[PDB]
């Protein structure tokens, strides 16, 4: 088993209950290091509509020792929550956030319609409509370079066959469930029990 015990509780509450979440293209990453793991809070809360745990099972079998837990938070539209699965393709998957096909983690997603929709629309959350190439697993593109779509040089300004690579979601308070924001906190585990920097909450060794 061989895990150490750190009295420091892991700040999953910080990640999940944060006031402001990042956009999908500029996906915010936090490293959960050197703390005891809290996973049953997530399991029992049950207000998380999507709790898809690849690799590890979501039925109370994640009391495991991890050397590294990576937490990623972004806000996307409801229709593309399926998009962010291992080995799936779409706009969000190939241009904003790509999940490795061997992902051993938990894609956690819940509604933020009250929090992340503002009257007259909320345009704070962006997404990359077009990009030159498909995005590699765990890569953030913050470039604002005008996408080329024609022989004409973009010259840095937008126009025909030259577009701003990013676009606004535009969540509205009265809108379809398919068109409402879902905060997603992708949890990436490494499942190494020998270093086990991220302590598991079971009795020591």
């Amino acid at each position, epitope marked *: 088993v061989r895990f150490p015990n750190i009295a420091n509780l892991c700040p999953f509450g910080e990640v999940f209950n944060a006031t402001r979440f990042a956009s999908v293209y500029a996906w915010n990453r936090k490293r959960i290091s050197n703390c005891v793991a809290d996973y049953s809070v997530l399991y029992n809360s049950a207000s998380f509509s999507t709790f898809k745990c690849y690799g590890v099972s979501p039925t109370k079998l994640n009391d495991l020792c991890f050397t590294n837990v990576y937490a990623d938070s972004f806000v996307i539209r409801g229709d593309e929550v399926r998009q962010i699965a291992p080995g799936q393709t779409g706009k969000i998957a190939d241009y904003n956030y790509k999940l490795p096909d061997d992902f051993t983690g938990c894609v956690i997603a819940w509604n933020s319609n009250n929090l992340d929709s503002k009257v007259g629309g909320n345009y704070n959350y962006l997404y990359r*409509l077009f990009r030159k190439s498909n995005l590699k697993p765990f890569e953030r593109d913050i470039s604002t370079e005008i996408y080329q779509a024609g022989s004409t040089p973009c010259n840095g300004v937008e126009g025909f066959n030259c577009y701003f690579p990013l676009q606004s979601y535009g969540f509205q308070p009265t809108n379809g469930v398919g068109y409402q924001p879902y905060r997603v906190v992708v949890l990436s585990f490494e499942l190494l029990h020998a270093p086990a920097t991220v302590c598991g909450p079971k009795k020591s060794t």
Partner: antibody
Amino acid sequence: VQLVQSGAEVKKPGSSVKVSCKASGGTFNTYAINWVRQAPGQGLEWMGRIIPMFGIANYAQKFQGTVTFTADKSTSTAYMELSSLRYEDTAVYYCARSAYYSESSGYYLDYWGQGTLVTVSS
Amino acid sequence: EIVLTQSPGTLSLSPGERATLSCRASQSVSGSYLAWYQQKPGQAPSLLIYGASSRATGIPDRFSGSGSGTDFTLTISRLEPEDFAVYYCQQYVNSPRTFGQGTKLE
């Protein structure tokens, strides 16, 4: 919806000036700001655009190196800096908002400010 | 660069009814990405039309643009007393958003 800017600059030749176009709430969010030089008794010249959210300002070949576009995300105000007053630089500087987003595909100036005229004097 | 040449240089002579305001470009305007701006004297130009014929908000539909490729038309059904300003052409088709010279400048 309203983009009230500066008035008139008593700038002696060679002395720099900064413009102060004021964006209303939500203008900066989804709209870029464009500057249009209107030299007295000529046509409209497109100096360039500033995308406030990502702080991107691109200028035309003519005005490159002679003018600087800045915008303040807090207070929602657009600024344009003239390097110095060259003799031909006297003009009515305008400010207008264009959609920069791919879906809208408008890239045209919807609303305009009153105008800021620079000159040797008043 | 896409340049523009407005042909009817001076139409502020109180003309009657239809006016065939034109604008042509060296390379054809692509995607009908042209707009028309009305510069009332002493004031800043207000958008009058955009696209090939897409009328602006708060502008009477009598002002139309019958443009193919480069938008070379702007038709006002009646020349009302208020509408005697300087109408401008602008293209946003991958250039430094070059304008025209103006069409009804006294």
